[PDB]
Structure formats: structure tokens, C-alpha cells
Structure 1
């Protein structure tokens, strides 16, 4: 019987700073035990300082990104070139996903950018449209590997102040873009080591008020 879904592997990662946000994703694309491409980008600039990635089944991922990009275009046409805010984009994406509630897009979607106060924002979606704003989110094949590391290093979970008898927590603070990129690179090298569908290359999209910058790093190709 024809199975309309497939698994293209890969993993993605979104972190929000004080005045910036990053959305990272490996460039490996796979089916079963075969590599289809070592450089197939799945993190896209969608305009209005919104970056997006829909990881999982690539056909559904591309379809979604394509539809959201198109939604941004028509938002301009219908509302006098108004900038689509990240919160409005998130709500719009929910309706895109939930529109196919009974034949879902097989993807973990993450978007990143700046909120209307200029602060870093990351939103994450389940396959059928439930969303939540967070400081931190890993998605895709190696999400279960990376996410607990992020809880520990970004949100300082389970870390107490030394000598305080486990009474005072390590205080929350925003990370610099330099520190965030260190965590992203270490997260992906660790994921590459222990997950077979993750590797080849890492592509990070950084979002500030100045625009969308890109950075690329090699990953192990085995």
C-alpha cells in the first residue's frame, strides 16, 4: 500500500538572545541508510526578519515554507506593506498546519526573529499546529539528544549556586551571540557523533535588527 510519508532526517535548533535570535540546522538530507545530499538547506529567510525551518518529511517541509513565504507576500498586498510580526506569523502558521489536521504536514516547525519590542524570539510547532514561544528549542531526529543539553546550558536547569546548599538557583541571563553560536556548534558536533542521520554541514541563520546573516560550518561526513 502506498505510504505518502517519508523521513528525510536531519535536525534543527533555535535559540533566542536579548537583541538577536539564531535558527540552526544541519544540511544533510537522507532516506533510510542513504545520503541524498550533503548540502540541502532547510533553514530559510522568509522576509520581514523571520527565519523558518520545517524539519522531518522534506516534501511537507518545503510545501509549508513555500505556503508561509506566500502568506507573507499576500499579507503585504492586503495590509499596505505592513510588517508581519513574529507573533502574527506564528498564529498564521498554526492555521496552515491545522488546516491539514486530518492529513498532517509531517514536520517539526521552528521560526525565529525579533518580537515587536526588538527582543529575540523563537516559536516552535508540533505537526498539527500547537505552538509556544520559548528561549530554546531543538527539533528533528536528534532533538532528544540536544534539547536536555540546552535546558542545562541555556536555561541553567539543575544548576545551583556553589556553596548555597542547593537553595539558590543559578540566575537566568541572556547569552551573547558568540556564546550562543558556541552552544549551537557543540550541540551539532555532539549530535553528529551519536546520531547517524545528522552530519555533513551546519548552517546557522542569525537574526538582528540589521537583517539576516548566515554562517556555515563543516560537520563529520560519516
Structure 2
């Protein structure tokens, strides 16, 4: 019997800062126990200061991104070159995903950028189109490895202030872009160690009011 779905592995990570946002993802592409590519870009600049990554079944991922990029183009045509806000992009993507409710896009999708007040924004989607704005989200193969670490090191969960013994929580101080990138690199380095589908390379897209910047880092190739 023909199975229309497949698993291309990979892992993605979105973090929302105070006035910035990052969307990272490894560059390894796989089937079963083989490597297809050590460098196959997974996070894309979709225009209007929005970055996107559809992780899971690569064919459905490429199709969704391609259709969203198209939706941005036609949004400009239809509404006098108006900038598509991150919240509007998120709602649009829900309807793209739910159009295939009974034959879904097999991907976990994340977009990142800035909201209309200039603050950092990350939105997270399931394969059938449920979505929500988040401060922090890991998606894909090693998502379960990374998220707990981010609960601890980004939202300071289970961390209290010394001397008080559980009475006073660690205050939720904001993180700089340099601090976030450190947590991203350590997350993927740790994921690479314990997850066979994670490795080769790490590509990070950083979004600020100035635009979209890229950073690349090597990961272990075994």
C-alpha cells in the first residue's frame, strides 16, 4: 500500500525577545537511517519581516511555505501593498492548514517576527491548524529534549531565590539577543548529542526592526 507521508527529521526552535525574535533550525535532512543532505535550509524569510519553518514531512513543509509566501504576495496585490502583520499571517496560516483537515500537511510550523507594537512575537501551529502566540517553542524531532531546558532557562521554572527556600521565585528578567543565541546553540548542541536526526549544521534567522539577519554554526556530523 502507498504511504503518502514520510519523516524528514529535523528540529526547530523559536524564541521571542523584548524587541526581537529568533527562529532557528538544524540543516540536516534524513530518511530512516540515511542522510539526504547536511545542508538543506528549513527556515525561510517570507517577506514583511516574517520568518517561517514547517518541520516534519519536507514535501508538505515546502508546499505550505510556498503557499504562504504566495499568500503574502497576493495580500499586497489585494490590499494596496499593506504590510502583513504577524497576527494576520498566523490566522491566515490556520486556514491554509485546516483546508486539508482530512488529508493534513504533516508538519509542525513556527513563525516569528515583531508584533504591531514592535515587540518580539512567536506563533506555533499543529498540523491541522491550531495555533497560539508563545514566548518560547521547540518543534520537531528533539522538541521534547529542548522545551524543558527552555522552561528552566528562559522562564526560570522551578528556580527560586537563595535564602528564601521556595518562598520567592526567581524574577523574570528579559533576555538580550546575545543571551538568546547562547541558549539556542546549547539547545542544539545538546540535542545533537542525544538525537540521531539532529546535527550537521544550525541556521538561525534573527528578526529586528532593522530587518532579517542570518547566522550559521557547525554541528556534529555523526
Q: TM-score, normalised by structure 2?
A: 0.99
Displacement of 1:174 in angstroms is: 1.6
Displacement of 1:173 in angstroms is: 2.0
What is the distance in 2 between the residues matched to 1:213 and 1:101?
Answer: 34
Superimposed CA distance per residue, residues 142-168 of structure 1 (whole angstroms, 9 cap, x where no aligned partner): 000001000000111111111112011
Aligned length: 222
Corresponding residue SS for 1:52: strand
- Aligned residues: CA RMSD: 0.4
Corresponding residue SS for 1:192: helix
Superimposed CA distance per residue, residues 119-153 of structure 1 (whole angstroms, 9 cap, x where no aligned partner): 00000000001001111000000000001000000
Structure 2 counterpart of 1:120: 120
Shifted more, 168-177 versus 42-51: the winner is 168-177
What is the distance in 1 between the residues matched to 2:171 and 2:14?
Answer: 21
Task: Show the 5 A alignment for 1:61-76.
Answer: 61-76=61-76
Corresponding residue SS for 1:199: coil
Superimposed CA distance per residue, residues 8-32 of structure 1 (whole angstroms, 9 cap, x where no aligned partner): 0010000010110000000000000
Q: TM-score, normalised by structure 1?
A: 0.99
Structure 2 counterpart of 1:14: 14
Corresponding residue SS for 1:108: strand
Moved over 2 A (4+): none
The unaligned stretches of length 5 or more in structure 1 are: none
Superimposed CA distance per residue, residues 59-116 of structure 1 (whole angstroms, 9 cap, x where no aligned partner): 0000000000000000000000000000000000000001100000000000000000
Superimposed CA distance per residue, residues 178-215 of structure 1 (whole angstroms, 9 cap, x where no aligned partner): 00000000000000000000000000000000000000
Corresponding residue SS for 1:47: coil
Superimposed CA distance per residue, residues 22-44 of structure 1 (whole angstroms, 9 cap, x where no aligned partner): 00000000000000000000100
Corresponding residue SS for 1:121: strand
The unaligned stretches of length 5 or more in structure 2 are: none
Task: Show the 5 A alignment for 1:62-101.
Answer: 62-101=62-101
